[PDB]
């Protein structure tokens, strides 16, 4: 969907200083710090003007902070339930696999304002296994409509399909 592609492109065009500014704002809200608010407004407001179906402020802020921390390369078809699920085929089934699965499954009982730390640990698990690509646009689209059952069903089904291979 147009509106998210340009948002991710603008995020990928940032330089070291803006990435550090967003990095130092992790775990914080949009209103308390002014430089982060100004940077987010400059990056986001024209997109909301031009496109009505642009991502909401909370999801965009969360995605910006996550991208600033992790800095993955955008690639279509590399969504989270595939890389996580292809990784889960190399762990010990008895002990490590349930521990990873519980952390992956905990996301279904949290709202968009509490999905920073679990996503952080999931992306750290990804980074520990030499992963350099991720689908940011797809992740944003899923996170926008996280309160719908078919979205979660498709998420889990994709995870299972990737895992059973």
């Amino acid at each position: 969907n147009r509106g998210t592609v340009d948002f991710i492109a603008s995020l990928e065009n940032l330089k070291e200083g803006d990435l550090g500014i967003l990095r130092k704002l992790r775990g914080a809200r949009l209103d308390e710090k002014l430089p982060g608010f100004d940077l987010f407004s400059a990056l986001w407001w024209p997109l909301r003007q031009k496109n009505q179906r642009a991502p909401k402020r909370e999801v965009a802020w969360l995605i910006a902070k996550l991208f600033a921390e992790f800095r993955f390369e955008q690639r279509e078809g590399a969504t989270l339930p595939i890389l996580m699920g292809g990784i889960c085929r190399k762990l010990e089934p008895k002990k490590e696999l349930p521990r990873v699965l519980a952390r992956f499954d905990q996301l279904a009982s949290l709202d968009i304002m509490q999905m920073e730390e679990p996503l952080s640990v999931i992306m750290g698990i990804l980074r520990k296994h030499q992963q350099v690509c991720l689908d940011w646009v797809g992740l944003t689209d899923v996170l926008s409509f996280w309160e719908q059952e078919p979205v979660k069903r498709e998420w889990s089904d994709s995870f299972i399909k990737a895992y059973k291979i």
């Binding site: 499954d105 279904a108 979660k152 069903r153 889990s156 299972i160």
Partner: protein, 169 residues
């Protein structure tokens, strides 16, 4: 006849028990013969009447298999064993998955259509009749595991694969 109005620890109400007087009849009196077999069953208990039913089965008269006929003659025990299995764990004096008993009669009624072919094993088999439970078990699994997680999906996949097992003695 072994029909009752309730499901006790040793019984599960499914439908007319048309498979009971089959091993005895097709091996002692009547044998294999092309025609229409009329079955009349009248359940009773001491001086109390329970129910009466009747059925008609189209028989061609093509041999018989002792083990398969004996397994067919003992199917209420298999249905009871399928019902009594709990959702998880093992508990003493556990009724076990009451939702399966709600869907058993419909599957039994659907299976009873090919009674003649199931009795003589022409084109119908136990595994062929086992397929009728798949859709109903899939519907039940959504109610039993109403979660959008991986564990719920795996549990539903495990639950879907339940079927009665033939027990000859």
């Amino acid at each position: 006849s072994k029909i009752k109005l309730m499901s006790n620890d040793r019984y599960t109400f499914a439908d007319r028990d048309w498979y009971s007087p089959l091993f005895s009849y097709l091996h002692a009196e009547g044998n294999s013969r092309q025609g229409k077999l009329w079955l009349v069953g009248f359940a009773s208990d001491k001086a109390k009447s329970i129910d009466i039913w009747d059925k008609i089965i189209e028989l061609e008269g093509t041999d018989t298999n002792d083990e398969l006929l004996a397994q067919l003659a003992n199917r209420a025990t298999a249905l009871n064993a399928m019902r009594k299995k709990p959702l998880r764990g093992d508990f003493k004096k556990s009724v076990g998955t009451p939702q399966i008993a709600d869907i058993i009669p419909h599957a039994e009624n659907r299976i009873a259509i090919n009674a003649g072919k199931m009795t003589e094993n022409r084109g119908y088999s136990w595994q062929d009749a086992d397929t009728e439970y798949g859709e109903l078990l899939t519907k039940v699994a959504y109610s039993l595991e109403p979660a959008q997680t991986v564990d719920a999906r795996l549990k539903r996949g495990n639950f879907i694969s339940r079927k009665p097992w033939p027990i000859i003695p």
